[PDB]
Design a protein around this ligand. Structure first.
Ligand SMILES: CC(=O)N[C@@H]1[C@@H](O)[C@H](O)C(CO)=C[C@H]1N
Length: 590
């Protein structure tokens, strides 16, 4: 696969060997970030003056003069070619050249390259991640890892805005970062730059902002401090606030002032972005003037963010048309998936789907708001990178599989198994849901239907359930022990324990269905109760946050099926043996 998939690809069914001996043409004039990647791939392979030509450069460079007609006339666009005669890596701009190298790195398969001609560019101008959730902000190390992941996947945007950073939100938005954090932010900016990512620093001042000179200057002074740390893109967020800070005329005036006195004054500022107080259709007043005021008054270069029809929603043609009409520019999408900050006891590891794939022209930008679990979020982030670069060719399931295989190549099938059953959010105040456990859902439905009305189940279904529980245990134990991405395993570990126990309870409940005799059934029954108590202990010891504490897993299909089957066979046993066993399914000490 190539991820994201390029706009145009012609494959010749030959392959060649990576030289071997090579002449590098343009390494002194091309994007240093791209040349660095190229030289790492060519490591210990000898440059000379005869032997295979490799030309690298940006449109306008001497090295790629011969290829100027093939270089797409798009921002971040590139032309790549591999044949017998030569290799060409030619960006329309410096970032384009870096992107050619990221595709080239994926083509190279143990010393071999396919013979290809690629013409490529993004459909959406700004693509990336807003760290913009409530909860424990991402660690320094996580963020460093994220930035490298973004470059590899051609995301050009990282918006720093954790709701619970005191120097981002109120009241200490007015204060400069202490030295330690300031130095960390400086290093993030440097790393972002190396990976061709725009570090966008957001401020969230609206809960206690006064519309006076004091707070204006404090804000601009903070932006100046961030500038000194290397920050060249900026945002002001007015989401999830009440009070005078919600005044659209004043917001517009503040943003225009920042634009006019700062964004348009510095030698080298890039994005200026704002998130409105009315940030989705349901939170908007169609009879109020809020969004039309922003649309009319905000300077045309300023971006305006949007989460869709609801706080949590997927982006539709009709939804984006509605906002675009009011804000008088293409919305810069803030997509609230996989963010789990309102369903904190769940991991959301399923595919990225639901967003219209034909509306690239109607958005300025598309960023994902991820989980507080940084590594876990890479499944979705990789998919959003693919979707935003090439929406027309976006393939939900293939990209999910490619994401997982990239993140954990040593145990991809185990991670697929875990992720497929850790997808849904459960019921929530936002009404947002995802599919989960789809493959076994008909087998489950048929198995359980057979019980509630009469009987009896198909053997192949009982066996599918059995196969699933077995596979869930292999997956749980192998992931726990995996050392390729330790940060990821640390993140998911509590859920992995709960997932293993779910599978064991499943196996035990299915032995109760097969109930050969009274005492065997009681042995299984007692084992299930013990497994229920073990799940209860994890739910009360792990992930004990103030909001949705604990650890839920395989909640959509698997846990309901196990629990219902348990209750059913206990019912039957109690009839058959005139017994009074407890049929309840969650352990309660009180
Ligand atoms: C603009 C925007 O989406 N703001 C917040 C966001 O910070 C929060 O993570 C989520 C997603 O749970 C929704 C909003 N309450």
């Amino acid at each position: 696969s190539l991820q994201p998939p390029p706009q145009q690809l012609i494959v010749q069914n030959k392959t060649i060997d990576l030289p071997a001996v090579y002449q590098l043409n343009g390494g002194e004039e091309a994007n240093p970030h791209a040349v660095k990647v190229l030289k790492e791939l060519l490591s210990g392979k000898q440059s000379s003056k005869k032997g295979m030509l490799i030309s690298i450069g940006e449109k306008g460079d001497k090295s790629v003069r011969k290829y100027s007609r093939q270089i797409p006339d798009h921002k971040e666009g590139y032309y790549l070619s591999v044949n017998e005669k030569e290799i060409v890596l030619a960006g329309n701009d410096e970032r384009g050249t870096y992107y050619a190298l990221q595709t080239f790195a994926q083509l190279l398969k143990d010393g071999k390259l396919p013979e290809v001609e690629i013409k490529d560019y993004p459909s959406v101008r700004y693509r990336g991640v807003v760290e913009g959730f409530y909860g424990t902000p991402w660690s320094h190390q996580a963020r460093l890892s994220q930035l490298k992941f973004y470059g590899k996947n051609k995301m050009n945007t990282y918006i720093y805005g954790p709701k619970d950073d005191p120097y981002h939100s109120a009241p200490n938005w007015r204060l400069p970062y202490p030295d330690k954090e300031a130095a960390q932010l400086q290093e993030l900016v440097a790393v972002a730059n190396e990976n061709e990512v725009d570090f966008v620093w957001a401020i969230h001042p609206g809960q206690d902002i006064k519309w006076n000179k004091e707070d204006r200057d404090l804000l601009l002074a903070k932006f100046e401090k961030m500038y000194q740390l290397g920050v060249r893109s900026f945002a002001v967020f007015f989401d999830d606030i009440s009070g005078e800070g919600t005044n659209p005329q004043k917001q517009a005036e503040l943003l225009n002032y920042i634009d006019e006195k700062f964004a348009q004054v510095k030698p080298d500022i890039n994005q200026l972005v704002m998130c409105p107080t009315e940030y989705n259709k349901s939170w908007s007043n169609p009879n109020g003037n809020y969004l039309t005021t922003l649309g009319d008054k905000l300077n045309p270069s300023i971006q305006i963010m949007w989460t869709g029809d609801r706080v949590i929603s997927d982006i539709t043609r009709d939804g984006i048309s509605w906002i675009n009409e009011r804000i008088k520019r293409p919305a810069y999408i803030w997509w609230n998936f996989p963010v789990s900050d309102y369903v904190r006891d769940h991991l959301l590891l399923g595919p990225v789907y639901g967003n219209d794939t034909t509306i690239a022209k109607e958005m300025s930008g598309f960023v994902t708001n991820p989980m507080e679990h940084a590594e876990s979020s890479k499944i979705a982030i990789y998919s959003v990178a693919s979707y935003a670069w090439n929406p027309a060719k976006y393939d939900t399931w293939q990209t999910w599989k490619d994401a997982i295989r990239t993140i954990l190549p040593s145990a991809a099938e185990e991670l697929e198994c875990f992720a497929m059953h850790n997808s849904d959010l459960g019921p929530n105040g936002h009404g947002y849901r995802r599919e989960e456990s789809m493959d076994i859902q008909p087998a489950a439905e048929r198995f359980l239907k057979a019980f509630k009305e009469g009987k009896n189940y198909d053997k192949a279904d009982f066996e599918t359930l059995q196969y699933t529980f077995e596979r869930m245990k292999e997956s749980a134990d192998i992931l726990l022990m995996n050392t390729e991405n330790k940060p990821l395993i640390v993140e998911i570990t509590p859920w992995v324990h709960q997932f293993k126990l779910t599978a064991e309870m499943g196996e035990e409940v299915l032995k109760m269905v097969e109930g050969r005799n009274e005492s065997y059934f009681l042995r299984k029954y007692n084992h299930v109760k013990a497994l229920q108590q073990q799940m209860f202990y994890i739910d009360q010891t792990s992930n004990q946050n103030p909001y949705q504490p604990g650890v839920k897993t395989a909640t959509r299909v698997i846990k309901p099926l196990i629990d219902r089957t348990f209750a059913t066979v206990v019912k039957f046993f109690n009839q058959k043996f005139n017994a009074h066993l407890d049929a309840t399914t969650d352990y309660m000490p009180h």
